[PDB]
């Protein structure tokens, strides 16, 4: 039993609303495993401190989950690389 957070950078090029459906479905595929999801929040538009491919802008999303090693970090660490509209992620422990 543990706690785990996650950040990830949804991109500006992609459609904001389709990506919104995508990220709420992420909230699903994360929380539905018994994951103590706390809040997911959108940073909004901002200049990336450094882009990766072409993304001058981008949106950020952070989640807090109080759960063991096998509910959200395991499943979405793979469901993040399949996630193509998004550039990156950062799952971490739920302590901030």
């Amino acid at each position: 039993m543990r706690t785990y957070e996650v950040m990830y950078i949804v991109r500006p090029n992609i459609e904001e609303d389709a990506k919104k459906a995508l990220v709420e479905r992420f909230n699903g595929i994360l929380a539905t495993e018994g994951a103590e999801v706390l809040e997911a929040k959108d940073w909004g538009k901002r200049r990336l401190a450094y882009e990766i491919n072409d993304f001058k802008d981008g949106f950020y999303n952070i989640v807090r989950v109080k759960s063991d090693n096998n509910k959200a970090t395991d499943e979405f660490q793979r469901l993040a690389k399949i996630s193509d509209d998004i550039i990156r992620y950062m799952v971490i422990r739920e302590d901030e």
Binding site: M7, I9, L48, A49, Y50, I52, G58, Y60, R88, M90
Partner: protein, 71 residues
């Protein structure tokens, strides 16, 4: 000694922070070159120094911070 830097700037923070919620405190944490103002010239204890450094290095990996910043 020893050779750390100034503390008590946490008068409105502490003990653990942030990690990222104020880019402006991180502007003062370390240098702006991508290189790191050392714990020698940052100051907070190696526990908090290490956690703040891994926060900023993640922001680099998080694209919240540039890994290296140009000029």
């Amino acid at each position: 000694g020893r050779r750390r830097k100034k503390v008590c700037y946490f008068t409105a923070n502490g003990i653990t922070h942030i990690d990222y919620k104020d880019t402006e405190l991180l502007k003062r944490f370390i240098s702006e070159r991508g290189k790191i103002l050392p714990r020698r010239v940052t100051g907070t204890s190696a526990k908090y120094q290490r956690m703040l450094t891994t926060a900023i290095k993640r922001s680099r990996h998080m694209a919240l911070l540039p890994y290296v910043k140009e000029e």
